[PDB]
Amino acid sequence: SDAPPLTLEAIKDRVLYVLKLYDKIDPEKLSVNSHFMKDLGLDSLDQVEIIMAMEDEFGFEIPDIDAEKLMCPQEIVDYIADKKDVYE
Amino acid sequence: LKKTTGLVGLAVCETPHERLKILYTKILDVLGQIPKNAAYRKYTEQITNEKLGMVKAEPDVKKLEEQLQGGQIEEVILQAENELSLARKMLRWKPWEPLVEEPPANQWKWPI
Amino acid sequence: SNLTLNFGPQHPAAHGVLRLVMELSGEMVRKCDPHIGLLHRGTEKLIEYKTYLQALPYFDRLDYVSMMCNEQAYSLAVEKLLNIQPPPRAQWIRVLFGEITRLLNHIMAVTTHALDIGAMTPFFWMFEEREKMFEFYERVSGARMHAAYIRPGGVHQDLPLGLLDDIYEFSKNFSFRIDELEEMLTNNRIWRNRTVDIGVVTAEDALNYGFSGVMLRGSGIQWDLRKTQPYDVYDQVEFDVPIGSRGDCYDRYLCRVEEMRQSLRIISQCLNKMPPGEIKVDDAKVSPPKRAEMKTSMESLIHHFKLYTEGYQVPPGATYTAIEAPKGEFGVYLVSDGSSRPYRCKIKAPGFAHLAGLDKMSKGHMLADVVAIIGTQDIVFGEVDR
Amino acid sequence: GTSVKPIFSRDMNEAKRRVRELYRAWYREVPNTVHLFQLDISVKQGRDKVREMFMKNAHVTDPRVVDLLVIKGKMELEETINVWKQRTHIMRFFHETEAPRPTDFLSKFYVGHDP
Amino acid sequence: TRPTIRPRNDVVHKQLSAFGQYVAEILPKYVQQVQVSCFNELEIFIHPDGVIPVLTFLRDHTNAQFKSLADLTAVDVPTRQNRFEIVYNLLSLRFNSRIRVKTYTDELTPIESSVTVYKAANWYEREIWDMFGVFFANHPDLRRILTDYGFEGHPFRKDFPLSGYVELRYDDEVKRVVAEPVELAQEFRKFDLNSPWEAFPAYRQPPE
Amino acid sequence: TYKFVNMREPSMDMKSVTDRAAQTLLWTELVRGLGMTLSYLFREPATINYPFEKGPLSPRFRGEHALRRYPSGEERCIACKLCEAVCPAQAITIEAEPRADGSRRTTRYDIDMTKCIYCGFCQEACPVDAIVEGPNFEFSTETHEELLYNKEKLLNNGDKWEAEIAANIQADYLYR
Ligand SMILES: CCCCCCCCCCCC(=O)SCCNC(=O)CCNC(=O)[C@H](O)C(C)(C)COP(=O)(O)O
Ligand code: SF4
């Protein structure tokens, strides 16, 4: 069959794996609720790179107006879950 | 009757008189929607009425070409089409209105 | 996905400096994108640092196949800005050498076009005539092509004794060389297969695309600047304007051959009507005095010194002056700020617009057809890039 | 009022959005440029260079100037994607044959007169 | 005033003046000035917004029929608030006449592209953008035409130096052509040519 | 006044149609072209036997530059710098000072022959016929540096070519 029924936990884990490969984010002080600008100190350009890596990982494009709101891993998880129609 | 206009891409027009009458009538109809005091309206109506009367007054195509001073009645038809398109664009643009802005003080001063 | 190809610059049919990015489906040409500037030397900016005399030789090197015609266009622009008149004998010499120059250019265009197509022999026959014509250039000026002979105010020097007879001797024989070229090409079925209905352009499209010269007259447009807007003494010579009917390569080639014949006619009239008199304007604030006068009289020495150091001041103003150069309308937009150096000099070259029309002209054709169309546009990149 | 005609953007937000689009396009393009031009740099080097070029103009606060900068960046990207640029043009961004010019006062004093 | 002096043509001067008045009457919204030079050349100075409506008129009106765009160029005048003068030279074959249309812009204000009026304008506008930095709105394909790939600056601006900023050479360590800051074995020698005495009294300006 | 170049019509009589068919099937115009090339084959060629034979040149021909002298051996050049001012390529560099006997003479006279465009404006501008473009055109070199002429090189050129230069000037100066 096709891909298994991806869930919120898998989405969060893959998002965290993608983020921990970013060289400007501290691997062990990153949480599901961390803010890229306030806590990680990431710049606006850095955020764009993070969303591009997310697009690569999850295989679907994210437009600029949607990508601007995503400011923490939890927002990215909720966006992906809403787009993929996943409630668990 | 004429074999070729001699110009590449310009076809020979059968019944040029009727085509010209239609085009000049359409031009006058479009110009009727332009304000009466606009110089474009009065000038174009004057020249269009001259050409329309000249077309109605001479049934020979060669003599009509000689009178119109327009160079080979097919090009007269093309020029009428161009004038009709311009008249529609001018109705949209309304250039009869006052100048939008005065240039800066020394915009056109030459030398320096 | 179409295949993308670099046609030139290092290509035989690319004229040395043209890089053409071509999108092809097989050999069908889906798109032509000419990339130019490989011979952009910044002429227009360099001229802003020269006097008008110092700027004159830059025009020899724009369309290096038609030198004296460029000189004449620039000289006419400067003379219009100066409000002066060249002497009649200078104007007759100018027209004569302009027609010799048209002969040179049409030989180059027709024979190189034939060489792209594949007929290599007429190039060799006609380039000896070009050589003889080069001697006429060198005898009048000391240089085979970059003469700098035609200057604002007239010409630099008078004709040497015996030049007119030799020009007559060449002119009474050139018609047979034209006949041999036409015997090789005009009725040949391979040549017609390579040229007929290739690069057909309509009259309306030719006008809207900025075309000039044969690129107009091949499509039936009855226009020639020598007839409609004459300069020098062109309103005193009789000639005919060749007019095409199909707007294709074959009609344009026929037009160029007939223009060569009409140039022979004009040259004959110029040879028989050359008047006596001075050869530059008798105004030492513009044209330099004779060397004997410079070494004898105080005013002549002062004016020589000033004209060769500072140059003449030109009254402020701007002119667009155009001529019927062998490749089409060649124009100069010259802006004078009142000083002895031009403020701005925009050069209008017919090949610029003609090459901008190449992608439109190549629609529905093959690679060899595009080679033929490049040849039929008569492009020199010295004037295209400037 | 200032009565100024825009180019593309009315304020700084739309200009910043266009900047982000151009940055995404360049970031995506860099690996293809490394492969096609046969460069000896890494993809990280190219992206770091792209970032550096963008950062060079971070101080601009005029939306029209930002729009024109984005237009020029789009022109450069189109030149790169179509391989109109050669390897020399791409490598010109790195200045690999220019000697390092000193910045402190003393070295400039020793070497010459330029301030 | 005989052989040396260029002759005048009053007939053409009057005809051009009348046609300039005609054009100014028809398009008062955009026409700012009309001039006829003494060598019989007609110039129409317009507001930038009227680039398309004026050109179209001059192309399509039955009494104008300026079907040919001979040339389109720009002139840089740094002392003006609007730096760049945009010049259109048009030719009418039907009436055997020429006309010049002039407008202005600065570094940051786009000019409407006229490719929908004259296709010939395409490359010309590219050249202007290449040489002066004037952006043309709604141009189908606007990019450099004359300069090298990646070239920075607009060479035809008056403040751009004649030799530019960079030059090229082949370097063997990297096995390629490289660009480096320009150094000249002989510096171009600036000449001061202007005479300190006025040449043309007819063009004297008020002394402020 | 104009003419048409391709506006003719073929006659449709059986004679002309059969002649056209014979041309199509028997390739008559191709044979005509072959005959033209065969005729050229038996003509005398236009090639000259260089370097034993040379192309004709005029007294006005512009060649390698030279600096000239008066018949007493004194240099003609008096360092007015008109040639330097007029030079369109800025190929001339001149430095001057009073000589030991007080004469106005150059200490530096350089022509960059890789900058030069060989226009002859320098010799037109010169008031004393000091700098000229001579008749020599065969002076190719193996290095760039040899084409940067100093004053000694130009004086040597004048001394070497004066016999020809004076005759050419005598031939042409009544036109100048
Ligand atoms: C391989 C080599 C290729 C080289 C390619 C070179 C391409 C050059 C393209 C140049 C493009 C531009 O200049 S585009 C002009 C640059 N943009 C601005 O100046 C706007 C104001 N500054 C800012 O917004 C911030 O500094 C910003 C850093 C942008 C982030 O902002 P955020 O934090 O709010 O997200
Ligand atoms: S020939 Fe012309 S370019 Fe050469 S040195 Fe003389 S003036 Fe200068």
Ligand code: SF4
């Ligand atoms: S060569 Fe002639 S023009 Fe040049 S400095 Fe000497 S005298 Fe003057």
